[PDB]
Design an enzyme around this catalytic site. Structure first.
Site, PDB file in Angstrom:
ATOM      1  N   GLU A 198     -18.551  -3.181  24.069  1.00 63.14           N
ATOM      2  CA  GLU A 198     -17.775  -4.421  24.283  1.00 63.14           C
ATOM      3  C   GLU A 198     -16.524  -4.476  23.415  1.00 63.14           C
ATOM      4  OE1 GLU A 198     -21.079  -4.453  23.323  1.00 63.14           O
ATOM      5  OE2 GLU A 198     -21.998  -4.964  25.241  1.00 63.14           O
ATOM      6  N   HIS A 239     -29.573 -13.944  24.124  1.00 64.27           N
ATOM      7  CA  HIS A 239     -28.626 -13.793  25.230  1.00 64.27           C
ATOM      8  C   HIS A 239     -27.946 -15.109  25.610  1.00 64.27           C
ATOM      9  CE1 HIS A 239     -30.256  -9.799  25.728  1.00 64.27           C
ATOM     10  NE2 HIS A 239     -29.630  -9.599  26.873  1.00 64.27           N
ATOM     11  N   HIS A 288      -4.123   3.322  -3.450  1.00 63.89           N
ATOM     12  CA  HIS A 288      -4.375   2.789  -2.110  1.00 63.89           C
ATOM     13  C   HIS A 288      -3.587   1.512  -1.799  1.00 63.89           C
ATOM     14  CE1 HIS A 288      -6.281   0.891   1.365  1.00 63.89           C
ATOM     15  NE2 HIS A 288      -6.424  -0.166   0.583  1.00 63.89           N
ATOM     16  N   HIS A 345       0.820  -1.210   0.000  1.00 65.05           N
ATOM     17  CA  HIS A 345       0.000   0.000   0.000  1.00 65.05           C
ATOM     18  C   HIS A 345       0.859   1.267   0.000  1.00 65.05           C
ATOM     19  CE1 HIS A 345      -2.401  -3.280   1.696  1.00 65.05           C
ATOM     20  NE2 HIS A 345      -3.491  -2.610   1.362  1.00 65.05           N
TER      21      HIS A 345
END
Ligand SMILES: Cc1ncc(C[n+]2c([C@](O)(CO)[C@@H](O)[C@H](O)[C@H](O)COP(=O)(O)O)sc(CCOP(=O)(O)OP(=O)(O)O)c2C)c(N)n1
Ligand SMILES: Cc1ncc(C[n+]2c([C@](O)(CO)[C@@H](O)[C@H](O)[C@H](O)COP(=O)(O)O)sc(CCOP(=O)(O)OP(=O)(O)O)c2C)c(N)n1
Ligand SMILES: [Ca+2]
Ligand SMILES: [Ca+2]
Lengths: 666, 662
Positions: B410, B472, B260, B25
């Site tokens: 999280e 859950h 890129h 890159h």
């Protein structure tokens, strides 16, 4: 009754249902009851007697722990959800599970509970409406015209997925998306200021949303004015900042974390009845209150008007009308099966050694003219995932298009696609490098749980991607998908298995299908007519011997070529060997005992799995007396061909491990 | 030489190394070279001769695909990264992998490549510096004082994780965090306006960041001024909006997605040399350019000055200085092993039926006074995960504390904790319901890849959580952790195995440890001294028969009690049965073969696994001729007791499946 009294019916049913279950969340239902009353009674376009009405508004409870809010609403407005079901909140096989679930509760649009995914699903439903309207509406015939309303709280706001989907919603100028933020200052750890201090209005303005600040969430007139303002803004999604008190009504628990996620208690409920002036006993609702809440007559009238509109559309545009009905039902074109089989047969008859990512692109190109319902995209990897076909048109360019540039938003993309599949009218496909399934991992699970049709195009499937190295090279990701209930996962070994897998995916009505695709070119294998048909059975005999095999290779994807080479070497030495191609473990496992025995006979214990993926998975098929040529480590940054050598994916090693196994057996 | 010529050395090395590898890159390295030249030459406090100096500034390349940028910087400033390594970019076992890797390469602070995680790691490093300074600094003795600088692009900005960690960074007032946004308007799909239109400056002001707009990313004066302004703002993290041209220097590929992620090509490189006025051959750097780039002399001077400061601190505060050194090295207290063993022995001798989430809290309470390096937290689930102990102090209240309220974040929590472990000085623990490991999944993998010590406290591990239901209730999550390379996963069956698992986690030096914990109460098992010692071996014989078993149950966590009850029933019939408790498959697998044979004899094929999780995992231990009492579906919303019954976790069913094998 006053608006407050009508909203209090929600508060009563919610706290009482939670109390009876000795489990659940009274806080959010009690805090949002006044907002729900205004939205549902004054604005929501819906028919309780037909929850599948194509042009209904869609509502989503993103703060899904407040499930009694939606159950109260569905019951009060006249959906097929009797009081008995509310009395069975959180009980086995009830229509009132602890978090709402699409499918077995009338009027529930999506399954929530995992924070943030509801707002993502709503963004998807809003994209679906916008795109469907652009595709189908005609001068004098606006047969698609409905809103998407979402409720969400601090949890959804904190989650990264809210950033992904609300950013994109701004770019797409989703003027029929209206979200209500339950701004109550409380989360599980306590007062949110210790961990959550965003100027949320300024954040959403940064996304290009129309934000309405400082709404009194306990004043019907204020809420109604805000909704009218949001509806007047046609060129931006709207966020309504609704200041509420969690557990509103409870003298001792309102405004406290204690009201979030446990029953209020009988003594507190008695005090709450007194504060609210709610006289009725648990699960008691008087006729007068039902009369004001019920939506059957309005709903009937609205759907009948729409049915008349659709009938006029069908007269003026019969082909388009038949397509709309077909697509809303999720039915496939009548000639698709035959045309797809013709494509597959053509590939088998005309070998091409190409990457399965390219074989996937070719299948998109083949299916594209047949499936106008496609609404596909990639998370900023179109030229790598190969998700564009000649007929792709991005919806940011033309609203009637069929392609979405999702940006670098894997989780948002997948949960948006869940919204798209839930809406009806489309068949979504999504795409990223297989590694980054890990970013979207719970949205993938949610598609499986919700039994949704979505094709998940996951390219760059192994160390075969080469130089990008261990952060990109999947090892354990395929195994993670394979053990997911109701997931289908295909790792095709050539362009033919790739087309079979694509056909399987688009035709799978009751769950998602992940395609595990290579960066590098894959050899085409020879197949009889029987073998070609057997690809769809998930595992099948590709090479065989006369009599019982001494050795069976089980291989997938890019490693079938290797297994076949080993099979040839051993065969020339007089070893009785077989090669099983296993493009889909889940499809194979679904075949009957007789078929599975024919492929992996119980008599043959000398089994060698070959796959550039985590080895531990394969004990399922090889048992304790076989061998596995797999990965046991992370990858490395190097040219792919050198990595395959390094990690033992060579004919010599596969042959040696097979012979070593046989020596042990002997 | 001019600053532009100095920056151009990065451009040449980067385009040439990419070309030689035929992979990589060049765009971001070329676009960010002028920014890097100002940051590294004028501000960065570092010593190339000691990349482990405790008080160095930390730099993070969150846009890690631009790996040649950091390799150019490390080489030019005098780190142990020779030119031959740059010439082996992306080649097997080089010090220059395609994305930067911590450990591989002198001076690389973290492993990036997964977009968004670098900035998260940087937030963690800034949290560590702020907390360590508050704990250790004394009047006249500021031994902790360093910045955290991050580079990041559109990809990192689009990712959800950037929202999580930058939101929290704002709340925590991380004034020594300075991020540079490579605002180049290009991503892989092309011009970003089709999919990314945020007013990013407004977004970051909404997080309480100080934002500097409209910096000319190709003008040293503009960049330098902005860095000075950011350093003067001490109460907010800063974002510098750096307008750059991707692939700057390339006449035909600058400002295009083409620059890129692929080599520019020989012809284009020649034109780029012409445009830049760069007259040196590939991998040629003249002595004058090295002379201005090299940081060995300044770096040694800065570190030596710090060493003298630390020596003075150690005279005044000997106990504190000893703790600082221990904690920075990641060493355990010398008496920790003995003290933890004493605690474990006490639990075995004093049985209690409690949830393993409570046993976890009790282990934190026992270890807290012993491990001042704890920097723990939960993702808005403190009262459910049970992550607070008596000595917990939240860092939003007390900067010298040991607890973080992470909010509902999280993924960000886990990658922040990776930054914390990478920094040195702390032992992070993080926590949420096990299901939501799926939100953080790649950050968990990254902890394992980077060989980082972090204890991951995952409660509510099965259908045993009850009424919250199938969104859950974990089923397949444990299996996915178990097959993750370098992951340790423990599913303790009682308070004693819970303490052993916690001990194993904190004593790991080279990888993370996931604790799989129950909502509901678990019975304590009786153990001999030998069994008690063998818990740490991951799998051990809990109940046995005389002679070779004819039937072996293998059970984990909440299902050990069930397996024991089946064992009692079959033993009474006269079956030679055994129960193996398998709290950690990875710890068991690492045992010597004689030990593994003593627990799971190869001749005994009649094996029954019992666990409220996905059945498919267990073929590893039961093979083709055993049985598995597991889950094969999603859960259901109902009370736990009724769910265990519904899904076949009953003595009758376990006994029946066992009798089928015999
Ligand atoms: C992605 C994700 N992360 C965390 C959660 C957990 N979560 C949730 C739950 O799992 C429910 O879905 C818990 O309430 C859970 O039921 C209890 O903790 C169980 O308690 P225990 O009796 O077993 O100890 S809700 C939530 C924080 C709430 O923040 P909000 O501000 O959204 O809630 P509000 O409506 O104001 O009460 C949080 C943090 C989630 N649902 N989804
Ligand atoms: C979480 C995540 N998602 C996507 C990516 C992928 N990604 C990346 C790569 O995986 C590199 O890490 C790819 O460039 C990859 O190497 C090539 O596509 C391989 O091409 P091929 O030859 O194999 O076809 S970078 C990228 C987004 C680019 O946006 P930026 O604006 O950050 O990049 P810039 O610095 O301006 O060039 C994106 C979208 C990632 N690294 N991390
Ligand atoms: Ca809240
Ligand atoms: Ca960019």
């Amino acid at each position: 009754s006053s608006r407050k009294e009508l909203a209090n019916a929600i508060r009563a049913l919610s706290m009482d249902a939670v109390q009876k279950a000795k489990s659940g969340h009274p806080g959010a239902p009690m805090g949002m009851a006044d907002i729900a009353e205004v939205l549902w009674r004054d604005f929501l376009k819906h028919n309780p007697q037909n929850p599948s009405w194509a042009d209904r508004d869609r509502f989503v409870l993103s703060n899904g722990h407040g499930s009694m809010l939606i159950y109260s609403l569905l019951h009060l407005t006249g959906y097929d959800l009797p009081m008995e079901e509310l009395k069975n909140f959180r009980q086995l096989h009830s229509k009132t599970p602890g978090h709402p679930e699409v499918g077995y509760t009338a009027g529930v649009e999506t399954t929530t509970g995992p924070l943030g995914q509801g707002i993502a699903n709503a963004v998807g439903m809003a994209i679906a409406e916008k795109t469907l309207a652009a595709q189908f509406n005609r001068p004098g015939h606006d047969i698609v015209d409905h809103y998407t309303y979402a409720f969400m709280g601090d949890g959804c706001m904190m989650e990264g997925i809210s950033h992904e989907v609300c950013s994109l919603a701004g770019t797409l100028k989703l003027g029929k998306l209206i979200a209500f933020y339950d701004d109550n200052g409380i989360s599980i750890d306590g007062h949110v200021e210790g961990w959550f201090t965003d100027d949320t209005a300024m954040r959403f303005e940064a996304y290009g949303w129309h934000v309405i600040r400082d709404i009194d969430g306990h004043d019907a007139a204020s809420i109604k004015r805000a909704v009218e303002e949001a509806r007047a803004v046609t060129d931006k999604p709207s966020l309504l900042m609704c200041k509420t008190i969690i557990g509103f009504g409870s003298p001792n628990k309102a405004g406290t974390h204690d009201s979030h996620g446990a029953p209020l208690g009988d003594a507190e409920i008695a005090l709450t009845r007194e504060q609210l002036g709610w006289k009725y006993a648990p699960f008691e609702i008087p006729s007068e209150i039902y009369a004001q809440w019920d939506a059957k007559e309005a709903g009937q009238a609205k759907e009948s008007a729409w049915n008349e509109k659709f009938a006029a559309y069908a007269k003026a545009y019969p082909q388009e009308a038949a397509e709309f009905t077909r697509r809303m039902k999720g039915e496939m074109p009548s000639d698709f099966d035959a045309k797809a089989k013709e494509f597959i047969a053509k590939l088998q008859a005309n070998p091409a050694k190409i990457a399965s990512r390219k074989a996937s692109q070719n299948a998109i190109e083949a299916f594209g003219p047949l499936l106008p319902e496609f609404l596909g995209g990639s998370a900023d990897l179109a030229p790598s995932n190969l998700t564009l076909w000649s007929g792709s048109k991005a919806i940011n360019e033309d609203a009637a298009g069929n392609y979405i540039h999702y940006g670098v938003r894997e989780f948002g993309m997948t949960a948006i696609a869940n919204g798209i599949s839930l809406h009806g009218g489309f068949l979504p496909y999504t795409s990223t490098f297989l590694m980054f399934v890990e970013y979207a991992r719970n949205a993938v699970r949610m598609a499986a749980l919700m039994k949704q049709r979505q094709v998940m195009v996951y390219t760059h499937d192994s160390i075969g991607l080469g130089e990008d190295g261990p952060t990109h090279q999947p090892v354990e990701q395929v195994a993670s998908l394979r053990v997911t209930p109701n997931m289908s996962t295909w790792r095709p070994c050539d362009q033919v298995e790739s087309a079979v897998a694509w056909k399987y995916g688009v035709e799978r009505q009751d769950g998602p299908t992940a395609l595990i695709l290579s960066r590098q070119n894959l050899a085409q294998q020879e197949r009889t007519e029987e073998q070609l048909a057997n690809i769809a059975r998930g595992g099948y005999v590709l090479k065989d011997c006369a009599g019982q095999p001494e050795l069976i290779f089980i291989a997938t994807g890019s490693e079938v070529e290797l297994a076949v080479a080993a099979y040839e070497k051993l065969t020339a030495e007089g070893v009785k060997a077989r090669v099983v191609s296993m493009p889909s473990t889940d499809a194979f496992d679904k075949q009957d005992a007789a078929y599975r025995e024919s492929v992996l006979p119980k008599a043959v214990t000398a089994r060698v799995a070959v796959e550039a993926g985590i080895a531990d998975y394969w004990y399922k098929y090889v048992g304790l007396n076989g061998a596995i040529v797999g990965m046991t480590t992370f990858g490395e940054s190097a040219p792919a061909e050198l990595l395959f050598e390094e990690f033992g994916f060579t004919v010599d090693n596969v042959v040696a491990k097979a012979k070593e196994l046989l020596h042990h057996h002997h």
